[PDB]
Amino acid sequence: PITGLVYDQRMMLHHNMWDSHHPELPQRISRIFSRHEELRLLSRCHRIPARLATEEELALCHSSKHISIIKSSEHMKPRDLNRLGDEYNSIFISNESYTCALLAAGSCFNSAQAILTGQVRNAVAIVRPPGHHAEKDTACGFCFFNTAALTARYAQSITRESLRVLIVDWDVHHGNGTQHIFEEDDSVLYISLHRYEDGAFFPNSEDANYDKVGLGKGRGYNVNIPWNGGKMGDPEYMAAFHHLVMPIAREFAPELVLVSAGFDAARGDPLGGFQVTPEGYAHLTHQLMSLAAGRVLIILEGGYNLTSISESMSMCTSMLLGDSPPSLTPLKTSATVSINNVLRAHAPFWSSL
Ligand SMILES: O=C(NO)c1ccc(Cn2ccc3ccc(C(=O)NO)cc32)cc1
Ligand SMILES: [K+]
Ligand SMILES: [K+]
Ligand SMILES: [Zn+2]
């Protein structure tokens, strides 16, 4: 029962040349890593080396044109970096962004390999920039390549094509890119919880609604749990896991679990407006560990309150390491509406609901 950890300070180099206080801060990963050290979690883990993803690996999910353009930013002048970033929705680019994105994805590849070859049982990836908004052909929402999506396809490439991967995305935002890459796929189950507000919360698309259940062979294998009209917290996320995430996950029977673990639904995050506690995140993690013979990889996505993300992700690693889940209640009626809309939408596909 070994827990793996990947972290590389070089991922700090990606930065916003025109706003040094932009919330997607280099110090997000350094503060998380320092907290793991202070709580003596880092020393209990097997340290997994970071590496660069290759261009061929990026092609598992991304087009050659998208790869080529982000790769070209390594040599761009500031004016061109500013212009290129402005072509995307909510993106800033520095000369180091491309290599930092490659390191984020390659770090998760080595961790997935460590889990699947049996070097470790589960692992945590402290990485940036994030991934789950990136699409096959575009960058978006602070994301250049879809790290989680690439890790599922990489895991299949070193095992078998039909390896069953569950991606649970508990970042407060919908992972539009992850949904789209796998929308027609029945080997990768995508389950996202996210603030939605009738499509008015970023990324501002009705793609995130409960009635997007997948396409073709992928019908049933895309589960959107959208939140409306309420500051949601531990009881809503616990209830969503009880009624939706875990029954569906168990019937899918994943062989590997990836968590797109944004912590911008955490109490104290200005971008999320929610109040999931560190104890709540620990309970979510502990529930996922009952799947896939414990093969769970926790991947940092969003999360912008430096203290909140450090405490929340540390609680997740503590659960992975086997520590007892900490001690933690009527739901907002809006959350009941949301959960029951997902249940009605997915009853045709999941007999255990
Ligand atoms: O993925 C993320 N975090 O993990 C993420 C990605 C992109 C953005 C874009 N963005 C940046 C400032 C800002 C303000 C308001 C809205 C808004 O309200 N739109 O409706 C959006 C905004 C935010 C968060
Ligand atoms: K999400
Ligand atoms: K899918
Ligand atoms: Zn987010």
Residue numbers in the entry: 442 to 769, 773 to 797
Text taken from the publication that reported this structure:
Histone deacetylases (HDACs) regulate the acetylation state of lysine residues of histones as well as other protein substrates, and therefore play a pivotal role in many cellular processes. Specifically targeting two or more distinct HDACs can also be beneficial, but this presents a particular challenge when those two HDACs belong to different isozyme classes with different structural requirements for efficient binding (the Zn2+‐dependent HDACs are grouped into Class I (HDACs 1,2,3,8), Class IIa (HDACs 4,5,7,9), Class IIb (HDACs 6,10) and Class IV (HDAC11)). We report the synthesis and evaluation of a class of selective multitarget agents for the inhibition of HDAC6, HDAC8, and HDAC10. Hybridization of the two inhibitor structures resulted in dihydroxamic acids with benzyl‐indole and ‐indazole core motifs.
